[PDB]
Design an enzyme around this catalytic site. Structure first.
Site, PDB file in Angstrom:
ATOM      1  N   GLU A 103      -1.952   4.314  -2.107  1.00 35.94           N
ATOM      2  CA  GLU A 103      -0.692   3.531  -2.372  1.00 35.94           C
ATOM      3  C   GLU A 103       0.366   3.738  -1.813  1.00 35.94           C
ATOM      4  O   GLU A 103       1.004   2.875  -1.054  1.00 35.94           O
ATOM      5  CB  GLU A 103      -0.693   3.846  -3.923  1.00 35.94           C
ATOM      6  CG  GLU A 103      -2.022   3.722  -4.694  1.00 35.94           C
ATOM      7  CD  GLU A 103      -1.672   2.981  -6.196  1.00 35.94           C
ATOM      8  OE1 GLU A 103      -1.056   4.155  -6.796  1.00 35.94           O
ATOM      9  OE2 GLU A 103      -2.036   2.001  -6.586  1.00 35.94           O
ATOM     10  N   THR A 195       2.078   2.790 -10.889  1.00 37.66           N
ATOM     11  CA  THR A 195       1.604   1.937 -10.084  1.00 37.66           C
ATOM     12  C   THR A 195       0.549   1.208 -10.655  1.00 37.66           C
ATOM     13  O   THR A 195       0.060  -0.037  -9.929  1.00 37.66           O
ATOM     14  CB  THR A 195       0.933   2.547  -8.800  1.00 37.66           C
ATOM     15  OG1 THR A 195      -0.218   3.351  -9.187  1.00 37.66           O
ATOM     16  CG2 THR A 195       2.013   3.587  -8.279  1.00 37.66           C
ATOM     17  N   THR A 196       0.095   1.144 -12.115  1.00 32.95           N
ATOM     18  CA  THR A 196      -0.339  -0.214 -12.739  1.00 32.95           C
ATOM     19  C   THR A 196       0.416  -0.260 -13.964  1.00 32.95           C
ATOM     20  O   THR A 196       1.008   0.159 -14.473  1.00 32.95           O
ATOM     21  CB  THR A 196      -1.879   0.586 -13.198  1.00 32.95           C
ATOM     22  OG1 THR A 196      -1.560   1.886 -13.796  1.00 32.95           O
ATOM     23  CG2 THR A 196      -2.890   0.930 -12.057  1.00 32.95           C
TER      24      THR A 196
END
Ligand SMILES: NS(=O)(=O)c1nnc(NC(=O)[C@]23C[C@H]4C[C@H](C[C@H](C4)C2)C3)s1
Ligand SMILES: [Zn+2]
EC number: 4.2.1.1
Length: 257
Positions: A103, A195-196
Site C-alpha cells: 500500500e 486504508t480500508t
C-alpha cells in the site's frame, strides 16, 4: 459493497465513504529524499513478549490474526507516540505478482506485500472509541519482498488452508509476532487513515525502513485465498491494496538518516 474489483474498488469508495478524498488519507508514497529526519523522535518500543494471539479470520478482504487486547500484553509505545497502544490484530495486503501488493510505496517502489500490525490507544478504553479519535490508532507497517523464507511467518502460511473463504476462522494461539519483525526498527512516520473503509483519519502511521523477506512459496499461498464465501463463485484474494493517496498538507518524518 466495497472491495478491490473493477466495480467496487478504491476508485469507488468515496461514494459510500466521502472521507476517501479527505485531508489525511493513507497509504502514501514515501519520498525518501523529502522525508525530514527528526532527531527528537524516540526509538520505538515494541513489547510483544506477552502477546496472546487467539484466532485467524478470513474477513473477505484479508486475513486477520487477532490478539487478546483486554490487558497490556503486547504494546507499542515511544517513537512519535504518546501513551500506550495495544496490539489488536495484524493482517497483510499483497499482489497478484511480486512487483505489486504494498500500500505504501518508497520512492514509487511497490513491494510484494505489506504487513500491518494494528494497535489502539489505551486512553480511549476500546478500539471502537479509539477509531473516532485523531490519535486513536498506531499501525506498524512492514514491507515484504520475495527472497528467502521468513521462518516466523510459516505458521501463518500453514493455517491458510483452513480459512480459504470469507467468514472462515480458526484457532490460532501462541503465535509470536516478534518473528515477523525486521532487524532494524528505523522508521518513517506521518498522520494518516485506515486504508480500508471506513477510511477513518485516526492513524499514526509508523512504517519500517527495512523490509522482511519471504519466499515465493509463502506469498503464493497468500494468493490461494478467496474473497468470496464458500459455495460462491471463486475469486482469488489478490491485489487487496489501496494505491497511494495525495500527501496534501503533511510531512513525513524519519527516525534515521
Ligand atoms: N489497513 S489498515 O491497517 O489501515 C486497517 N483498516 N481497517 C482496520 N480495521 C481494523 O483494524 C478492525 C480491528 C478489529 C476491529 C474492527 C474489526 C476487525 C477487528 C477489524 C476493525 S485496520
Ligand atoms: Zn492494512
Amino acid at each position: 459493497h466495497w472491495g478491490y474489483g473493477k466495480h467496487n474498488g478504491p476508485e469507488h469508495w468515496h461514494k459510500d465513504f466521502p472521507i476517501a478524498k479527505g485531508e489525511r488519507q493513507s497509504p502514501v508514497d514515501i519520498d525518501t529524499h523529502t522525508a525530514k529526519y527528526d532527531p527528537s523522535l524516540k526509538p520505538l518500543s515494541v513489547s510483544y513478549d506477552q502477546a496472546t494471539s487467539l484466532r485467524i479470520l478470513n474477513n473477505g478482504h484479508a486475513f486477520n490474526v487477532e490478539f487478546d487486547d483486554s490487558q497490556d500484553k503486547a504494546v507499542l509505545k515511544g517513537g512519535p507516540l504518546d501513551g500506550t497502544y495495544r496490539l489488536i490484530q495484524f493482517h497483510f495486503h499483497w499482489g497478484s505478482l511480486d512487483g505489486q501488493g504494498s500500500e505504501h510505496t518508497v520512492d514509487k517502489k511497490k513491494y510484494a506485500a505489506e504487513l500491518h500490525l494494528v494497535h489502539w490507544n489505551t486512553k480511549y478504553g476500546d478500539f471502537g472509541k479509539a477509531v473516532q479519535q485523531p490519535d486513536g490508532l498506531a499501525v506498524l507497517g512492514i514491507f515484504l519482498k520475495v527472497g528467502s523464507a521468513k521462518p516466523g511467518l510459516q505458521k501463518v502460511v500453514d493455517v491458510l488452508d483452513s480459512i480459504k473463504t470469507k467468514g472462515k476462522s480458526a484457532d490460532f494461539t501462541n503465535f509470536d509476532p516478534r518473528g515477523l519483525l525486521p532487524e532494524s526498527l528505523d522508521y518513517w512516520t506521518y498522520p494518516g487513515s485506515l486504508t480500508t473503509p471506513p477510511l477513518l483519519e485516526c492513524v499514526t502511521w509508523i512504517v519500517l525502513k527495512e523490509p522482511i523477506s519471504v519466499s515465493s512459496e509463502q506469498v503464493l499461498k497468500f494468493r490461494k485465498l478467496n474473497f468470496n464465501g464458500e459455495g460462491e463463485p471463486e475469486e482469488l484474494m489478490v491485489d487487496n491494496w489501496r494505491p497511494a493517496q495525495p500527501l496534501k498538507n503533511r510531512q513525513i518524518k524519519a527516525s534515521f538518516k
